[PDB]
Amino acid sequence: SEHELHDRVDKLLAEAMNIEDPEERRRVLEEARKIAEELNDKSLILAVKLVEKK
C-alpha cells in the first residue's frame, strides 16, 4: 500500500510539473503533500517539496 501511495505522489508531482494554471498546480501539489504527510514518510514529503520549489 505504501509503494502504491508513493506511486500516486510521484504521478501527481509529474503532473504538476507541466500545469499552467497556478491554482490548479497548487491543488495538485496539495494532493501530493496530503498523501506524503499522511504516510509521514520524510523522503516522500521531501519529494513534494523539491517540486513545490520549482
Binding site: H3, H6, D7, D10, K11, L13, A14, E15, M17, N18, D41, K42, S43, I45, L46, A47, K49, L50, V51, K53, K54
Partner: protein, 136 residues
Amino acid sequence: GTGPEEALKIALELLRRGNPEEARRVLEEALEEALKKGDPTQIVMLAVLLADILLHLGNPEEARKVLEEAFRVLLELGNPEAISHIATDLAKVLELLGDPEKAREVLRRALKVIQELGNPEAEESVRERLEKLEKG
C-alpha cells in the same frame, strides 16, 4: 519541442490509457536529453516515473538501470533534495530486485554526499530510509 515537462504529461496520459510501452519510450527519449541538459528536478521526475513504469511492466532490471544512471548524474549537481528522491527510489527498486546490500550502499552514498552539501531535511530523509530497510 517536447521538453521534460511535456514528456511527463504525455507519458502520464498514455500510461493511464493503457499504453505503458509508449509512455516508456516517450520518457526514455526525454530522459536521454535531460541527463545531459536538464536540471535536477527534471531529471528526477522523468527518471522516477520512467523507472516505475518499467517496474510494473515487469522490467525491474531496466528500472534499476534508469535510476542508477540518473543517480550518478544527480550526485554531481549539488541538489541534495534531488539526490534524496532518486536514491530512495533506486534503493527501493534494489530491494524489490532482491539486492538489499546494494540498496544500503546507494543510500549510504547518497547520505554522504548530502552531508557534504549541507541539508538536514535531505539527510533526515535518507537516514529514515536506511532505518525502514527491514522490509522485503
